[PDB]
């Protein structure tokens, strides 16, 4: 069907400072069921539950602090 789109996630994770849903979706059409399955698989429940707003917190640097493993999981998601 010059190279096609390639997914990637470096050793040191890279984060925005925006909403978590925007952070993971990364400018893609929001598929609700797929996103829920992904976050459930990504072990994101503890952080979103403990986060004050949940799935709308200001994630990333200069926002709400996270953990390296949590950030890596968010990236892989």
Partner 1 sequence: LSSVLHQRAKIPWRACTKYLSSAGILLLSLLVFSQLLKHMVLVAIDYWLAKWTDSALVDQSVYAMVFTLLCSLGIVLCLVTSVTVEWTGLKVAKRLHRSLLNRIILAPMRFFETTPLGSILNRFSSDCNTIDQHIPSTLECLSRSTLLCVSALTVISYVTPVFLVALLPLAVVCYFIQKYFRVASRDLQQLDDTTQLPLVSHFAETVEGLTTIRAFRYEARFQQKLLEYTDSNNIASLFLTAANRWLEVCMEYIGACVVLIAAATSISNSLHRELSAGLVGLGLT
Partner 2 sequence: MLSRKGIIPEEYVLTRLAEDRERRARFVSKKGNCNVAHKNIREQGRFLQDVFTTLVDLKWPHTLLIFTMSFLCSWLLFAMVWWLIAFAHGDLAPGEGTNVPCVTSIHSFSSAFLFSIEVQVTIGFGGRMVTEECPLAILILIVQNIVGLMINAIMLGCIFMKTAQAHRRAETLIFSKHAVITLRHGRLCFMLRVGDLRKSMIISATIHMQVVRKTTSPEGEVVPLHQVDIPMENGVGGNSIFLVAPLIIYHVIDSNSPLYDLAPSDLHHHQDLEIIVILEGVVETTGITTQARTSYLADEILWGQRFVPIVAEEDGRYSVDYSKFGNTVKVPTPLCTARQLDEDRSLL
Task: Please choose, from the candidates 42, 49, 53, the residue with its C-alpha nearest in 3D space to the C-alpha of residue 19.
Answer: 53
1 binds, among partner 1, partner 2, none (CB under 5 to 8 A by kind): none
Tell me: is residue 11 an annotated ligand-binding position: yes
43 binds, among partner 1, partner 2, none (CB under 5 to 8 A by kind): none
* Closest distance of CB 3 from partner 2, Å: 35
Binding site for partner 2 (CB under 8 A): 58, 62-63
Are 59 and 16 contacting, i.e. CB atoms less than 8 angstroms apart? Answer: yes
Helix (H) or strand (E) holding 49: helix 45-50
Degrees (nearest 5) of the Cα angle 44, 47, 52? 135
User: Rule CB under 8 A: which residues touch partner 1?
Assistant: 3-10, 14-17, 26-27, 60, 62
């Amino acid at each position: 069907l010059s190279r096609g789109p390639v997914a990637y996630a470096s050793q040191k994770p890279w984060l925005l400072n925006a909403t978590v849903e925007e952070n993971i979706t990364f400018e893609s059409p929001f598929n609700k069921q797929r996103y829920k399955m992904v976050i459930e698989a990504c072990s994101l429940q503890p952080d979103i539950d403990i986060l004050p707003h949940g799935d709308q917190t200001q994630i990333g640097e200069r926002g709400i602090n996270l953990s390296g493993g949590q950030r890596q999981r968010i990236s892989v998601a």
